[PDB]
Amino acid sequence: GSRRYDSRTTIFSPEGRLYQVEYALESISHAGTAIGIMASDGIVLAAERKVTSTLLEQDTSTEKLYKLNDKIAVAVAGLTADAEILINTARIHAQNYLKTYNEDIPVEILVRRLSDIKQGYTQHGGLRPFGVSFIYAGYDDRYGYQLYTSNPSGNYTGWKAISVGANTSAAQTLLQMDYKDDMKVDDAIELALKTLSKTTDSSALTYDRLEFATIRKGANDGEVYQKIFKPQEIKDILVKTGIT
Amino acid sequence: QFNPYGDNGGTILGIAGEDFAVLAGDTRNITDYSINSRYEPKVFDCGDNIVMSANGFAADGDALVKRFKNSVKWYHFDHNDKKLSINSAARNIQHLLYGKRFFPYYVHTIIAGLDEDGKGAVYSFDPVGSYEREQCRAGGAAASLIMPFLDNQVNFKNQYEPGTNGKVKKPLKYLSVEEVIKLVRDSFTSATERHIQVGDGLEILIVTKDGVRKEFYELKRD
Amino acid sequence: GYDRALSIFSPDGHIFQVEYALEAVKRGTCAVGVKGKNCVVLGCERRSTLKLQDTRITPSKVSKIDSHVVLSFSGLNADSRILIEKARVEAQSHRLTLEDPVTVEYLTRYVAGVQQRYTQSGGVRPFGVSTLIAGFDPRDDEPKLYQTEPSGIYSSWSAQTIGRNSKTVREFLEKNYDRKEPPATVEECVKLTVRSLLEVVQTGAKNIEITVVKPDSDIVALSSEEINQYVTQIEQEKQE
Amino acid sequence: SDPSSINGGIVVAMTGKDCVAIACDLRLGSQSLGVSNKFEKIFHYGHVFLGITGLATDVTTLNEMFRYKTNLYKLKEERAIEPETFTQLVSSSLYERRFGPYFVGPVVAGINSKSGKPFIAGFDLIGCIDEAKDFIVSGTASDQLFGMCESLYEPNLEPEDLFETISQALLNAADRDALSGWGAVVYIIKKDEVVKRYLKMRQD
Amino acid sequence: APLX
Amino acid sequence: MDIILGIRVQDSVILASSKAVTRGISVLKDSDDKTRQLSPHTLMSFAGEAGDTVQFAEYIQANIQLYSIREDYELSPQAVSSFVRQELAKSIRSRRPYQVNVLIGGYDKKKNKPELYQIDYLGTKVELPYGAHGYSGFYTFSLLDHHYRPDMTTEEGLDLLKLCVQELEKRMPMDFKGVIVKIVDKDGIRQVDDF
Amino acid sequence: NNYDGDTVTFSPTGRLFQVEYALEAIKQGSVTVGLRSNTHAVLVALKRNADELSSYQKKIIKCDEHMGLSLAGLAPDARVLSNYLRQQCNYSSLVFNRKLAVERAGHLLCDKAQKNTQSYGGRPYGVGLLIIGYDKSGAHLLEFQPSGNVTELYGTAIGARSQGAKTYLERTLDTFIKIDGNPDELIKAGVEAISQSLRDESLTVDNLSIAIVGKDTPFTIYDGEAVAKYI
Amino acid sequence: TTTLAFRFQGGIIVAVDSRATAGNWVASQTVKKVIEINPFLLGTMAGGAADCQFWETWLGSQCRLHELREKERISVAAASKILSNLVYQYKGAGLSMGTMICGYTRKEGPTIYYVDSDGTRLKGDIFCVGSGQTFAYGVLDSNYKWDLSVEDALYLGKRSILAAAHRDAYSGGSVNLYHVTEDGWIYHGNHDVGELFWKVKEEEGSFNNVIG
């Protein structure tokens, strides 16, 4: 029968590893780097677009940074198509919670459920896992500003600063060096861009190969604002820190 | 609107002795004011020295007997030809009846036989499976006529010892098979006189350790 | 539905998928359980290749199943969440029907049954997780500590460890734990637990987690400084 | 036991010169018993306003449902939903429950941010769109509201004048209905400012 | 059916 | 079932619930507690159809307790009331709806404010300074409209509540065998034993 | 070789190896014999034990008052198939008030076994059956193979060393077919038939299993001291 | 039916009548309305005869499975809740049951739960259930004290059923008595109302409404 052609996507190796999860992580390590940095007064999300062409429409484009709700966003590393499946599920989940409790969903609850979906694909169903790693950046009134990451295994962890995708080893060492706890958003913006600039596989970091976003309480009094940076705004912030 | 139930009349009667038990029933079958059959038996030997009758709506009665007979067959297959005791049969019949709690078998069921100590046994059921062991039970159309007579003549109810000032009751004792059959025949002739759905013929099944015996008697055919 | 029998017997009579799930447990961070005269202590290793972590929000290694029972584990972190969720649901379901919280044995028996089911169900792989389940039965002061594993077998332990280098810490506990006289106090029990982890861990900084469970739903997690005091005290007695 | 008249309540909407108004009473009762005098029946999703009369549990449920749907709309579309589009969404959602409907009388009001055109619309319980140049009415005093609006209304009223007309329409209609009243709220809506006014009315 |  | 009342004052929410359980022409019990603690600072009283009431109350209790264990956190009274409303809103279009009316009294620890929610079996939620279900409201609402002030103390709230029970004991047809009174504040839930 | 992974695969010479491997399980089974006259049909079965402490595996199963079989191979598969026969015999009685013809019983078993040889996932039955019965056309003996093939015979035998009894019955055909109105003699012939398949072991009292059905005899099984008469 | 059970100083008394009726027809005078679930648990029957008998023997099987699985006798609370949750699933389907689950365990002590077919479950000290419940209440309430002796408590339970048997047309037959202690239930005999009424009348001097 069809047994012959089954890859058996949800089995253990003799060493106790999940083949498909490991190979999905290998795929993600070639994707454009994405960095998240959590400051005391906000969060920065910075991501490098995958080798751009000059005829690519840059302003009406979205590849790395997605909005889940007004208080939560994600940076993507891996297959974009896979990520959009998960993003729409996460968007719906947030609205289900709001409908049920009349309160915006706590960040961890959203992260746990999305991670549980990934876990399911590694234990049952015989399907390939999602080749995606997320950086979650969000705010709620319990823990305030939070950074999380999830990967194809469905395992998630919290961070002060973290990178996913390519050159995470080099990126993490650089973040670990210059990061400190009393840091501000504007300093974190600079750290994020400096780290990408040194870890990039490109010749020089330019505005057209970046996506950028902040989550501040920099609105008016006790409320959170999501700022997905426009091309010209990335051009300006790149000049302001003296990278170009 | 379609009515899935009917009333086929007739009446049945079970009495237990010391080492025997009888299950009697008239052979008349009716609908409304018509006679369908003057001889249509409704007391059956179900094997393992168990006799059974399910009186009321004959279609439901036949279905139940059919299912119980089948239950006895599978009891042998599944438990190494073990004899189904009368108490085990009774419990099994409860589940048959209660299984249709929300669309009931429209029958009053009586079974008779010997218990595991060799003593006579009669069990009676309501339509949805409530059951009880008794020395005595009449069922069906003329149950209300016969049952009080049985209370008086089998269980000696309302009978006191003469000259004892109504202080000492008439003592309970087992009846011989000859005495029991006298009561059965008189019960059915009386019921035939005063109930229109009862008559034609009487068939008695007697159960001892030797097996199941039958006796037939004519009843008035009007 | 995906039906494939993934867990099957081999010629020598082994179920390799279950045995490979045990290897995943062996890779996981070390977890230890020690029960005293009036308490149970759950100790857990946290690897230090991860700096820049946010410990406020990062999932804790020891999880409350109910107010009186806790669960720690070694192995795949994502797999453990599924077991913990099911256990928490069963805990509330038990309170609803029996009008009494679960015993530690019952909760363990349930979790172990779930694990077993995933070893002979089609289309699923076993859980790459072994658990330590500790607590106190309702209206009871006798400490309880149980262990489960991917195969589905479970058992009670005076003290036990699971995860990487668990054979080293088990060796330590086997000579340092007296059955005739268990750690009489909370301090003694925590110290023996911290000592056992210090055989394997590295630094006693933000690498060790300790959770103490006492009778009548009295569970608390120790902070860094509180644990660091045990680390400081043990090292000074060692130099002798 | 008529679902649309257990709790009581009314909503009315009107158009003016480069503006729209939507108003509602505050009563929530259980037949004769007045229970709450704070039960607002007008909600908004961005710049689009929705008033709902009828069974209060369905009023609450539908508000939560349309907040849900407009939030997902905005995330995917990257823009606020417009009144014309939202009107269609309400109609689709109500007709989905054709043979087990929400017992409601919704009313959409707002200004299209692109064209600047004032827009109002009404629905029956199962989705039928009722578009109007002038006014839409709903609730247990709909007969009264129809009478007040038809006589008092004139086209191209200034925002300040439109406020007086819609307020007098609602107040005098509510006072002829046992199940409506107990306070009132009026929304005056211009292209980029919205004023909300609570009216003084008789409390019987 | 009988009641009790 | 029958009588459940609620009063929100300055610093607490007070719930009063009748003790009688009547079936036919017999009062089967005169000490019934028609309430369940959903969380340390949230209490729910209930009245309605026999069986449904307790079954619904305990089902909600189990769900909130499950949430508390999962997140190691207490849901706000507003969040719990919305969850309860949705369950009743689902129920009303089921094959057999829960015929249960509830009051939810809670103290929000983040806002430091008492909160009282009235929810009927249809899923009709309102936040109120004082609430009642069934025929009780026909006496108590007008009484409270007159005597209630928003800045009252817990003691003043209890005296205000005594006034309601006295009126009900005078004018109500049925003997409801008094009430069990419980207070919800910053320190949690406690029962008044002598009422 | 490469074509024996499942029942859904034909070999290049048109063989079904999984069905053939199922057939092999019957050959390993203990010998059982079947034979009939015009009035009676008899089953004789050699029972097998695990060791001297164990019981002897029962080989004969009753299906109805007028029908039953003996088994050789996987006993649980015989239980499944016999249960199916019990139901089919029973359906015929309840619905049509009709005793199931032994020939129809054979057709029903054939079709049930066949379905397991043409679909993915399943496996063939691993047991052979000898069905005896007495119906409206007299005494009958059937041989069931899990390939699906069912065959009506005067006499036969299946299991290990069944060729000895099968040869004997082939010689004795003219004699035992005319043993009419004499149960004990027809059994004697069957007991002598199964004796041709014995090696190093002989027929003892808790080793031999005999069953008989006929004109005025319901299907009944004899074990223990009731077969001492025939040793 | 008339059934009662009350808690007191010396444990629990349980008393029931034995009559079954189909309308005005007296179907039986010898029905067993107490079911012995285990040596420490009793169940009483009122309402539908089949409904009560079927589901309470089913309850006994569920209690047996509990002690096999948990190696411990089931609590009265848990046993009663199995029955109440069962009937709640059938709510609206037309089951008719008024039952009392009575027993002793170490953690609970003597405990009585009222369970009926519309899903009501109540812990309590005194309950009377059935068509004659009010007649039983009248006698039981007006003579009840917590400090009754085992001898007096047994008599009061017996006397309360007799009162209902006499006045309620749909109660009668005989009285079945039970006493539940820390050591389990104890049967205190079948008492025919035929003899018991006259014996009580003569010895007690009550029932003066009746022609002596």
Place this chain on the structure above:
Amino acid sequence: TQQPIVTGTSVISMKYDNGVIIAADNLGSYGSLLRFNGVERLIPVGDNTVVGISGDISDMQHIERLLKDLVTENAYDNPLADAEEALEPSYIFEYLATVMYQRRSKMNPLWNAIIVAGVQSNGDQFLRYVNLLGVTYSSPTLATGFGAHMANPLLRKVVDRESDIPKTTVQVAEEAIVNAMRVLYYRDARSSRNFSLAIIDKNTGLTFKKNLQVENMKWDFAKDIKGYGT
């Protein structure tokens, strides 16, 4: 739940010494309208059984198809289909009785009253009744509808009990059946003059008589009857 539309009236039958007789008229009524006149309500199964059906005709035609299919199915893999393994009257009845009771139990009955008449392989007479309720019974005489009220009393004068069957010839039995059919034509408002009759004998086999008419009727006395009293 149904209501019968096109209907057939009485089916009557009795046992005699060597076999059974059964009869039914050829009418398909549509309420009070005597709509169809060429309707055959006796359906033979093999050469040993006749099934007589009254009630709803659409359901009768369905039952015809079932019996037709039963003959086909019985012949499958059956070398003795025309001998020892031919369909017996008892098999045919039990099958129909099973169907009738199953349909009533699903609250969607076949709105019919059925009489299965035939001779068994051992020569025994078979005669049994079944209806929409699944009720079954046997008697020396059987009849449906008005036949139960008017035919049975007449047929029971010939065969009143079991012992009267050997004493009753086919000539006497047929005479009683034909007389009963005349009485039904006098008194049943949904009867016709035309009918079919079938005899199943253990010696001569199945004889199926079509297009019979009620004759030798008494009407002459009607001329003397004038007014309604005075």
Place this chain on the structure above:
Amino acid sequence: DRGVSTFSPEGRLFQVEYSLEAIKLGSTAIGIATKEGVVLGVEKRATSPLLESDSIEKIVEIDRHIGCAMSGLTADARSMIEHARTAAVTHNLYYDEDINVESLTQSVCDLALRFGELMSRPFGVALLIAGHDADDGYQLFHAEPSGTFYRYNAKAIGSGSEGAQAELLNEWHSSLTLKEAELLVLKILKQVMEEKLDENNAQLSCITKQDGFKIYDNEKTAELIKELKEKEAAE
């Protein structure tokens, strides 16, 4: 790979044969049947000294008149026991009687072959089912994952089975008392066990008509162990 329900060329099911190898790795369990009762004994075999041995549950009650011992992948036995208990209680509900020991065993064995591509694999555990009923008296059954069960006068399963079985062949006779059987299980367990036999690493149980199924205390077994050592030294 290959089908789960595949036959070998020798006419055996691969998976069933492989599960039998898993059972050989299991701890020893012994059962002996007498006219005074049936005795069931098992080797506990704790993997570590810190493990509390009394939590090792390899002897189990099915009903009052039926007990059970296991060997192999013991986690697999839980659903088998659950089914056995339900089957026993359900039969009592339907028939107001005790279920026959053989009928119980047959019900458990019906689960065995319900695997394939139903559960994904056979059970990796063998069961010794011991009980009493009125018809056939005291009985001992060996239930395998093949779906086959044999009645035994005495039987050993597990790692030391073939050595213990040969010993049971010599020692068993039809007149053994219950006490004689108890000592015989202890004797044979002590012979095949790795570690030295005591009350903590071995467990005894029995089923009698009068008292039903009982697991012995560690105090009661300890005295039988002491009685056994004294009797072997006494000649």
